Amino acid sequence: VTAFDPTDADVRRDPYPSYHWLLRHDPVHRGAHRVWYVSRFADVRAVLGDERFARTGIRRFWTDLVGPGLLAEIVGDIILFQDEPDHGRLRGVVGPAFSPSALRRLEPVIAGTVDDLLRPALARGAMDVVDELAYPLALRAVLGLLGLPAADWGAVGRWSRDVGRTLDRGASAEDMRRGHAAIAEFADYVERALARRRREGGEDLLALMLDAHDRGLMSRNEIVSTVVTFIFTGHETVASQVGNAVLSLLAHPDQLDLLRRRPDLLAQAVEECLRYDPSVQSNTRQLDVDVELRGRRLRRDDVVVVLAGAANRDPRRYDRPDDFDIERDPVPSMSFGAGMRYCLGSYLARTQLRAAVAALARLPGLRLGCASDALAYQPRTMFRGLASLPIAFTPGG
Ligand code: HEM
Numbered sequence: 497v498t499a500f501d502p503t504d505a506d507v508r509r510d511p512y513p514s515y516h517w518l519l520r521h522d523p524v525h526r527g528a529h530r531v532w533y534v535s536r537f538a539d540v541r542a543v544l545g546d547e548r549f550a551r552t553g554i555r556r557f558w559t560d561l562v563g564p565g566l567l568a569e570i571v572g573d574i575i576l577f578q579d580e581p582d583h584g585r586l587r588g589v590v591g592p593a594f595s596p597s598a599l600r601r602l603e604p605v606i607a608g609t610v611d612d613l614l615r616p617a618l619a620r621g622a623m624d625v626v627d628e629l630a631y632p633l634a635l636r637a638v639l640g641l642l643g644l645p646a647a648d649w650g651a652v653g654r655w656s657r658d659v660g661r662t663l664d665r666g667a668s669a670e671d672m673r674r675g676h677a678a679i680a681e682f683a684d685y686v687e688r689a690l691a692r693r694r695r696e697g698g699e700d701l702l703a704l705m706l707d708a709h710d711r712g713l714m715s716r717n718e719i720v721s722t723v724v725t726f727i728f729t730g731h732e733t734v735a736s737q738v739g740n741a742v743l744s745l746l747a748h749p750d751q752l753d754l755l756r757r758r759p760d761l762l763a764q765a766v767e768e769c770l771r772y773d774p775s776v777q778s779n780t781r782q783l784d785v786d787v788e789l790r791g792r793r794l795r796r797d798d799v800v801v802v803l804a805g806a807a808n809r810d811p812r813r814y815d816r817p818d819d820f821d822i823e824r825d826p827v828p829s830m831s832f833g834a835g836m837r838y839c840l841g842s843y844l845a846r847t848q849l850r851a852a853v854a855a856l857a858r859l860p861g862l863r864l865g866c867a868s869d870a871l872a873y874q875p876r877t878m879f880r881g882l883a884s885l886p887i888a889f890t891p892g893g
Contacts, residue, residue: 500527502778502801502877503666509873511777511880512818515806524792531799532792533778535806537813537830539789543781543802545835550579553782553797558663562672567679571659573721576729576837583836589708590722593641593701594840602640603847609636609646610851614893621891622865625742626884629852630735637848638730642723643700644689652727655682660728664876679724686720726841734845736775736874736881738852743871743885744769745857746864748820755822756857765822766849767829772820774831777805777880804830805880861890 497517501507507514518525519535527533534543543549555577559568571577575586592598613632617623635649644652655678661667662675693703705722708714714722745752745765755765781800786793794800807830809817814824832839839845856862865886872883 497522497525500525500533503528511805512809515803515809516818518803519806519810524790524794526792527801529799531801532794533806534789534800534802535810537807537810540802540804540807540830541834542789543800544779544833544837546787547580547836548784548787549781549800550784551577551583551781552579552784554780562662562675565676566683567659567662567676570679570683570717570721570724571663573715573718574725575722576725580836585713586718586722587840589705589714590701591840593704594843596843599641599843599847602637602844605640606633606637606847607851609633610855614855618893619891621861621893622886622888624865624884624886625856626735626739626882629856630738630885631731633738633848633852634731634734635727637734637844638727641701641730641844642726643698643702648685652682652685653731654678655685656724656728656731659724660732660878661876664878666877682724683720686723687716690716690719730841730844732879732881733775734841734848736879737770737845737849739882739885740773740775740880741766741769741849741853742856742887743882744773744820745853746862746887747868751820751822752857752862755853759854761822762850762854764824764826766846766853767826768820768822768824769849769853770831771808771814771824771829773880774804774808774829775879775881776831778803779833779837802830804833856887859889859893861888863888 497514500514500518502511515535518533523534523536523539525533525535534540555572558577559572562568575583578586610633613629617628623629631653632649635653636646639646639649639652658674658678659682661671689702690706693706697703702723705714705719709716709719745755755761778801781802783794783796783798783800785796811817813827832842865888871885874881874883
């Protein structure tokens with residue numbers, strides 16, 4: 497692997513042989529376009545806990561790339577684009593809404609919505625897990641978190657993908673026009689939700705943000721941008737992970753049987769899915785100062801990508817790392833990051849993946865609806881996710 501490129505077609509559909517080489521021969525690697533790639537668990541964790549590997553250079557590049565106006569002003573304010581102290585401020589505001597305690601309200605909602613999504617599939621004995629389970633579930637869950645009407649999932653998912661794809665460095669004139677068009681409609685939506693809370697009340701996350709705005713801790717734009725942040729990152733990551741999880745279990749029929757026979761293994765089966773095929777393969781940073789790493793000299797202003805996908809396959813951390821083992825000891829992975837930017841939504845994620853996998857393993861005759869090889873990953877670099885995952889089972893469920 498002379499210069500690693502995640503945009504390469506081979507790497508898009510199975511990056512794991514590239515990773516194996518990387519963490520064995522070049523753990524801190526200068527890849528395509530002079531982007532550094534960090535592979536090993538120890539180093540990934542090192543980078544993520546270091547504020548010097550920052551997001552500000554990425555924000556400024558992106559806002560000047562999209563140009564002046566509503567899109568720049570709103571998406572410019574997103575938490576993913578901030579360093580301290582703005583990052584700490586926004587995280588302090590929304591943080592308490594994501595506690596396991598604060599999220600018990602959603603358990604029956606999420607279990608319930610998995611049921612409702614399975615429901616039209618049962619008599620058919622077939623389903624595309626991506627279209628019909630993964631995406632709606634993830635969108636309904638993050639809407640519930642916010643306190644927004646869960647029936648708006650489609651419209652809001654669309655706005656968020658149109659806006660979100662505008663951060664994808666491989667952009668289009670078409671993507672852009674749609675992004676600018678969707679941010680306007682999206683912003684209206686949120687303002688109408690805020691006004692409803694202004695006049696009616698609420699105890700939801702959107703209400704907690706509106707209150708933070710009143711105490712001057714958060715601007716109107718920051719509320720809108722936080723809403724956009726959660727919906728976009730909240731739904732694509734979870735949806736793709738539900739798909740990957742089901743694939744991981746279908747690919748390993750014996751592991752599926754074990755879980756089916758031993759339902760107590762659900763929690764760690766999910767952990768293993770997160771470990772083995774994470775929907776977020778990597779995260780980007782840009783250095784504010786020279787930093788030394790495994791003898792490599794990474795320069796001020798260099799772009800640095802940490803590979804959560806590779807770090808999860810690190811032999812220094814995991815015995816037989818390339819094997820899918822649901823009975824492995826649940827030892828924390830990199831799938832939710834570390835340090836300052838650790839995943840606020842990890843519990844919400846787990847609740848969804850547990851409910852989705854529980855309901856699907858419970859199905860007699862569960863199998864792939866197509867051939868193993870006909871599967872295809874989505875064209876974007878931002879997440880690892882299937883375009884389609886047809887499954888079949890015994891009609892009746
Ligand atoms: C399986 C699904 C998910 C995966 C694999 C995942 C993964 C990650 C990772 C790796 C990070 C660290 C980002 C970095 O270091 O640059 C992160 C951060 C974050 N995630 Fe998640 N996540 C998932 C689901 C969710 C959900 C459901 C939400 C709720 C809306 C959420 C909200 C956030 C937020 C707010 C951050 C903070 C980023 C920052 O402070 O810059 N995530 N996630």
